[PDB]
Amino acid sequence: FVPNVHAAEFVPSFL
Amino acid sequence: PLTASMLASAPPQEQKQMLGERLFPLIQAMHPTLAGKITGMLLEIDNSELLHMLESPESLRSKVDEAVAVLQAHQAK
Numbered sequence: 147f148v149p150n151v152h153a154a155e156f157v158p159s160f161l
Numbered sequence: 162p163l164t165a166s167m168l169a170s171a172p173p174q175e176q177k178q179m180l181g182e183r184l185f186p187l188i189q190a191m192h193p194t195l196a197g198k199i200t201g202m203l204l205e206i207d208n209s210e211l212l213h214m215l216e217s218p219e220s221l222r223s224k225v226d227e228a229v230a231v232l233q234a235h236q237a238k
Contacts (some may be wrong), residue, residue, distance in 0.1 A: 153232045
């Protein structure tokens, strides 16, 4: 696994 | 618990979100501010491995530690 610093942030929005 | 069967039967466009919802609180426990970014980075891993990470705390921590080491180095430079 090579981490991708460009990855989209996971926004918590589950309710 | 989220199972492989549940994931495989979900529309592909919901699969990452389903995994993310279960991984996020665990990653947030480890890293309360970087959690969103680290979760996003981990979600690029394939779904089989993500499900394994959900079931194996040592596996999740190893991936989180690698993402954090890389992210923090990136932030610093």
